[PDB]
Amino acid sequence: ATLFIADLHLQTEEPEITAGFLRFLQGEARQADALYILGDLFEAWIGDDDPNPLHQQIASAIKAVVDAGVPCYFIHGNRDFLVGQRFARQSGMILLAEEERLDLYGREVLIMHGDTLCTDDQGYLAFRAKVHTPWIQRLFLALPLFIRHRIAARMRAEIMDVNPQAVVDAMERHHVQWLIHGHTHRPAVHELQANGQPAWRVVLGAWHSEGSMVKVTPDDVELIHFPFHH
Amino acid sequence: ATLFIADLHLQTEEPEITAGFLRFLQGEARQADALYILGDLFEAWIGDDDPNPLHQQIASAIKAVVDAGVPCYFIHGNRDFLVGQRFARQSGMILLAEEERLDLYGREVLIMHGDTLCTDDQGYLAFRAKVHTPWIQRLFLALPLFIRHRIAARMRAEIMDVNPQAVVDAMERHHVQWLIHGHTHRPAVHELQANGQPAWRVVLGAWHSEGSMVKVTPDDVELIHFPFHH
Ligand SMILES: Cc1cc(C#N)nc(N2CCN(S(=O)(=O)c3ccc(NC(=O)c4ccccc4N(C)S(C)(=O)=O)cc3)CC2)n1
Ligand SMILES: Cc1cc(C#N)nc(N2CCN(S(=O)(=O)c3ccc(NC(=O)c4ccccc4N(C)S(C)(=O)=O)cc3)CC2)n1
Ligand SMILES: [Mn+2]
Ligand SMILES: [Mn+2]
Ligand SMILES: [Mn+2]
Ligand SMILES: [Mn+2]
């Protein structure tokens, strides 16, 4: 089985979500062929040089999974787009592109965070375009850490769902009948049409009282919710 | 594993849902310790004497599961409250009460359809009280089938969510930390408090483009959505 998760929004303020994630990495994840994390692993990221102890606890847990023989992969979310090659090295995770077309036991699946599909949000997309410009990233990252923290705090003081056409267009660009994403925090299986055939869009949930994952096997694709009852 | 499903709303008009259900009974269900169907198996029911061919195709498929060594159980929904002992015999299913407290590998779980929790719907509950009165049922069922059909058709020409307090009260009456239901067609895992401890309410989805089930093992409880991709 290949596993997909997203929208953990991990942070110092929410230790119970972190514990649920650590339990998942130590249990479920070890049995998998691979683990894909489709963005918003962290609630925020201002650079890999951040000494936040949570960051190292998380990289250390993911690295254990990778070292146990289960490749882990990452696609950036809107929250954690500044996750970089240094974290990748610490965690053993491989950074992937904003869209990837996978071959899962012969089934072709498109994966992404899902924020790019939300084309009705002009505000978000203007923001995204700027923070995805390399020289704007390298500017922000060249500031002293204490100034990056002030910038984030000052920003602080509902997520728009996908545009249906944008979904079709993406599945048609990749010629696939399967899409897995998060971002929208609306866990669901959807049926549609793409490439003249039936297609499915499987949406992951955010981690709060529950976790969620998509499990892909040779014959099946399942969206699973689990409570943190341990 | 023990499996829970609900809200299939099976009907002549929707053969693709019926095929998804038959595939599930022939595959997934055969591997289980038991199968519980928590109501709204059928979109409508006007009595067991109805010769609708769908009714016999469904009973025959469920009976195969029971005969293969997997007990099947049923709790009535609002739609199919007139399902009776004759169908039970045809299907091999055991009829259970509107609330049951189960022991699943040491875990105590409350199961029900969920309509009784929806105490904000005065209209529904007035209806329910009447159609659950035995002598009102036996009156309706004593009519000729052709008159029962007219009555249903004439009735034809959104589902209220649960009352949060009603949920707590039910879990507290049974002294349980686990509740599984359907009815509301809002598949989700919810955390709450009952009996002074953390509790979980696991809600099944309706079958249309997807199926859903709750899988209970010694150590885990999972809500699973599956598309009908075969
Ligand atoms: C390179 C660059 C330049 C400048 C500078 N100066 N600033 C930064 N960020 C880095 C990321 N951090 S963050 O992690 O705390 C963060 C903060 C806000 C968002 N905002 C959004 O994602 C967003 C924006 C618009 C509309 C919707 C949005 N999301 C959907 S939402 C509702 O979750 O916030 C994302 C990450 C804030 C500072 N980066
Ligand atoms: C014993 C008795 C007496 C009389 C007579 N005369 N009539 C009957 N029924 C049997 C059931 N059939 S049914 O299966 O077609 C059916 C029809 C309507 C409902 N209505 C509701 O469930 C309902 C009613 C009020 C508010 C909400 C409701 N549901 C939530 S909903 C929106 O799904 O319909 C249920 C079953 C209709 C006739 N039974
Ligand atoms: Mn998110
Ligand atoms: Mn996001
Ligand atoms: Mn229903
Ligand atoms: Mn119902």
Numbering used by the authors:
A (entry chain A), B (entry chain A): 2 to 158, 170 to 242
Task: Give passages from the manuscript.
The LpxH enzyme cleaves the pyrophosphate bond of UDP-2, 3-bis(3-hydroxytetradecanoyl)-glucosamine (UDP-DAGn) to yield lipid X (PubChem CID 123907) and UMP in the fourth step of lipid A biosynthesis. Roughly 70% of Gram-negative bacteria, including the WHO critical priority Gram-negative pathogens for R&D of new antibiotics, utilize this enzyme. The importance of LPS, and lipid A in particular, for the viability and virulence of Gram-negative bacteria makes the inhibition of lipid A biosynthesis a promising target for the development of antibiotics. To enable a structure-based drug design approach for the optimization of JEDI-1444, we produced LpxH proteins from E. coli (EcLpxH) and K. pneumoniae (KpLpxH) and solved the X-ray crystal structures of various enzyme-product and inhibitor complexes during the optimization of the chemical series.
Since the pocket accommodating ring 1 is very lipophilic, the introduction of polarity here while retaining good target affinity was a challenging task. Optimization of the π–π stacking interactions between ring 1 and Phe141 led to a library of substituted heteroaromatic compounds. As expected, the introduction of polarity here was a trade-off between lipophilicity and target binding. Nevertheless, to our satisfaction, many analogs showed significant improvements in serum MIC. The best compound in this group, EBL-3339, showed only minor reduction in MIC activity upon the addition of serum while retaining good target affinity. The X-ray structure of the complex of EBL-3647 with KpLpxH shows that it retains the binding mode of the original hit compound JEDI-1444 (as well as EBL-3339), with both protein and ligand closely superimposable.
